[PDB]
Ligand binder design. Structure first.
Ligand SMILES: [Ca+2]
Ligand SMILES: [Ca+2]
Lengths: 316, 316
């Protein structure tokens, strides 16, 4: 079984990389780069540099799209610059990788990877869906050929985090997210309804410091910036959410989550634009195209998370 | 076990009465009257007249509130006048009951009934929540004293029917619905996500005509107006939804539905005003105050529905 991450790297996005590389059930083929937490290019610089630091410079980083499906440009919002920092990695200084982005676009890498690995391929996007929307656009065959998609984004049964009805990764490109959900590809949405139950504090990051490694000190320094940002943006939690890693955890082990079979859409037109919600049209259709996560085994996920990442940090 | 309906009577609302009176597990104590499908008073005229027609003039009809929690007045919207008719009963001519509404308000009847029957009481509102909001307002003890509330209204995982995010009964008084959901009373929401899976066509109403009774001919004539309205307002279904009856069916037999334990709210302030949605604040609280219906045994419900109502129609 073989894994592609699609990342706006990104603090939680590197924790997804760390969980992936700490997990022996998947071979991480490549990291597709996208935008949001940080500018698209910055996403690639970080991906390369971090994959190197953890001891896996075989991870080939491809180059996705800079702006949204229906926008001309993109700037990083100052809110996301406060949370993930300016570099998008806390503000942790880390040497640039001398490796660089692959020649082909990430759009084509996905399409190619689908035709190579078929149902062994698992695509886990924890940034905007912009990339796989363009992939499904150019090559709609993907739907049936791909093994499974397992995204982080949206909020079904709960308030979003950007506004009352939309979540960040969906907010940045709703139209793309709609195309994906409607596509009929075997998607598993892991939204806020499950990720806001996840938590880690300095109790957990102090364990990474105890390993005394280049990687251990990095991940600790990084997520401590992320927690101190959360201390002001959401003091009602105490630490930080484990959003993007959980998507990867469910990709490897779908029993970590309890899903609700449901044909879905994303709202494009109304004043609820960017909301993840069931399509009424396909309610009575018994064949459910995707599944939204509603319950989660938080203590087992937190143990799986620390075991995998602390094991990887010991290796570098 | 003892039942109170809270009805904007109402085409589907009389089907709820019919299911209730056809069900031997509950004694229907009274029908609290409310507004929406038709003017509040008209709700009472119909309730009295219909309870008589089915062979149960012991059902005491009480008088709830005319307008919403936060409004001065109320008019019937022309959309609901098209669906349920002008009289609110198709346009089926039926003799007025010479019995009239009880002296006390329905607000007080509920509060009194809670203190009399305690945990044997089951309150099943398939109109606006306006009435039980005022009851919980005046007497908040109800929460813990009452057996269970089982409403019809809202839409959690799907588009509403008034707009993309709100359902009729919640739309008419959102602020009341919020008060109920937040109250912590043992509510079970049966919203569109489950009721739009229910269906009946002329195949089913022709069976009621075959019984040759006063009641059989009435219910057939009535729901055929309701289906011909649905033929224009929603030709994607073919017949009509069994919205309000299903709430009663789940009150008698909660195994007809698969619920999702979830602390809920109703949106009051935003441009999503009137939306039924989980409260994030109480997501990590393990104690779930109410449960939203997401799955349903449609063929068993449809059989239970016809068995009970055709049995009752044979009696008149
Ligand atoms: Ca992200
Ligand atoms: Ca009704």
């Amino acid at each position: 079984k073989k894994l592609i991450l699609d990342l706006d790297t990104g603090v939680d996005d590197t924790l997804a990389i760390s969980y992936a590389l700490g997990s022996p059930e998947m071979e991480l083929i490549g990291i597709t780069g996208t935008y949001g937490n940080v500018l698209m290019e910055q996403g690639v610089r970080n991906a390369l540099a971090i994959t190197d630091l953890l001891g896996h410079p075989e991870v080939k980083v491809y180059k996705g799209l800079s702006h949204a499906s229906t926008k001309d440009s993109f700037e990083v919002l100052p809110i996301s610059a406060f949370i993930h920092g300016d570099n998008g990695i806390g503000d942790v200084e880390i040497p640039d990788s001398p490796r660089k982005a692959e020649d082909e676009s990430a759009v084509d890498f996905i399409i190619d990877s689908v035709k190579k690995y078929g149902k062994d391929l698992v695509y886990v996007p924890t940034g905007p869906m912009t990339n796989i929307a363009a992939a499904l656009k150019k090559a709609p065959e993907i739907k049936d050929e791909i093994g499974k998609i397992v995204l982080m984004g949206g909020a079904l049964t709960i308030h979003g985090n950007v506004n009352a009805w939309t979540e960040a990764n969906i907010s940045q490109d709703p139209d793309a997210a709609d195309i994906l959900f409607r596509s009929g590809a075997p998607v598993t949405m892991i939204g806020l309804d499950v990720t806001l139950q996840t938590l880690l504090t300095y109790k957990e990051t102090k364990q990474w410091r105890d390993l005394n490694t280049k990687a251990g000190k990095f991940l600790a320094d990084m997520t401590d910036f992320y927690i101190k940002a959360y201390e002001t943006t959401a003091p009602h939690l105490g630490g930080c959410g484990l959003h993007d890693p959980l998507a990867v955890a469910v990709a490897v082990d779908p029993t970590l989550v309890t899903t609700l079979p449901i044909n879905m859409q994303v709202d494009v037109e109304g004043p609820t634009r960017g909301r993840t919600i069931g399509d009424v049209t396909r309610l009575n259709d018994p064949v459910k195209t995707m599944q939204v996560a509603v319950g989660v085994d938080v203590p087992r996920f937190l143990n799986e998370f620390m075991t995998r990442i602390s094991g990887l940090a010991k290796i570098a």
